[PDB]
């Protein structure tokens, strides 16, 4: 099923999460090809992951560096596991903050329990050129994922 | 996924190249909406696009001439010949430096003291007049123009 090209962290046909550089949001993707490119500083060869997005074939094949690819998110935190300072993957909608949106990394800043509900607030990390959003109320506190590493 | 508006060349969410009306060069874009506008005769299609890397410019209305399938194929040197209309990287303000992607009519090519050189007429569409006898500095990155 999975084919090891012999380098890089992901197999051909492996299902992964891929980050869109403009948005900062993570999307379900699949490795289609893995290539190498010279480092700029004479260091180790840099790995390029060629991915396709599972629900967005219109995007074609996109070439990404390691920072923008990781194993597919699969584990959700229990409430007691959430603590300020953790970097976690959350759902958030920057345009309509009360609604479902995209999947972003966030630094948890604060959690509390009110008389009505459990609340989590976090610093949302956006795109490479995009600033962070502070004190974002994460509306889906039972859908906060652990970020996987290779 | 793509969505068919029922007319025109491009689907909703389709990724394309689209001209900057405020510059004349071509930019990665995506179809947002497709509509028709009254002409007096045949209704004309309006493609509403957003530019991938310029969200701040929002959605812009373009006619078909200012939208085309995204560039994907580079020419080999041996393929370049005077008269061809191709897409090149050029900077009108600092002509030796990288700029943006303009259509160009190839006028001359030659090898000078081992350096491949290409000269051509830079086209701006209707964003401005053409720029004649421009040296194209990036001769290994000259692209085929796609059609619908």
């Amino acid at each position: 099923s999975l084919i090891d090209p012999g380098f890089g962290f992901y197999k051909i046909n492996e299902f992964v999460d891929a980050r869109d550089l403009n948005m900062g949001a993570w999307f379900e993707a699949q490795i289609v090809k893995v290539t190498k490119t010279p480092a700029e500083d004479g260091g180790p060869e840099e790995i390029v992951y060629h991915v396709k997005y599972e629900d967005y074939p219109e995007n074609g094949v996109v070439q990404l560096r390691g920072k923008d690819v990781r194993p597919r998110a699969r584990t959700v935190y229990q409430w007691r596991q959430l603590e300020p300072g953790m970097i976690v993957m959350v759902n958030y909608n920057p345009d309509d903050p009360k609604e479902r949106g995209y999947w972003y990394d966030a630094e948890i800043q604060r959690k509390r329990e009110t008389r009505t509900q459990r609340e989590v607030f976090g610093k949302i990390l956006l795109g490479d050129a995009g600033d962070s959003l502070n004190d974002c109320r994460i509306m889906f506190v039972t859908e906060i994922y652990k970020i996987e590493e290779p | 996924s793509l969505i068919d508006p029922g007319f025109g060349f491009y689907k909703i969410n389709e990724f394309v190249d689209a001209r900057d009306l405020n510059m004349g060069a071509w930019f990665e874009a995506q179809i947002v909406k497709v509509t028709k506008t009254p002409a007096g005769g045949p209704e004309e299609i309006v493609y509403h696009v957003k530019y991938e890397d310029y969200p701040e410019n929002g959605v812009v209305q373009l006619r078909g001439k200012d939208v085309r399938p995204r560039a994907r194929t580079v020419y080999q040197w041996r393929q370049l010949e005077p008269g061809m209309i191709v897409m090149v990287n050029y900077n009108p303000d600092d002509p030796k430096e990288r700029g943006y992607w303009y259509d160009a009519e190839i006028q001359r090519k030659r090898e000078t003291r081992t350096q491949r050189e290409v000269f051509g007429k830079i086209l701006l569409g209707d964003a401005g007049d053409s720029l004649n006898d421009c040296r194209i500095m990036f001769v290994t990155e000259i692209y085929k123009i796609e059609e619908p």
Binding site: A18, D20, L21, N22, M23, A25, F27, E28, Y53, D55, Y56, E58, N59, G60, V61, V62, Q63, A73, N91, N93, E99, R100, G101, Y102, W103, E143, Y145 | N13, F15, E28, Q30, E52, D53, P55, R70, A71, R72, T73, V74, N89, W101, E141, Y143
Partner: peptide, 17 residues
């Protein structure tokens, strides 16, 4: 499968970029 809203990623492949 994650529940999502909104559209897809903003960038598509572009060989020149």
């Amino acid at each position: 499968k994650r529940k999502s809203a909104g559209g897809g990623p903003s960038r598509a492949g572009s060989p020149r970029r």
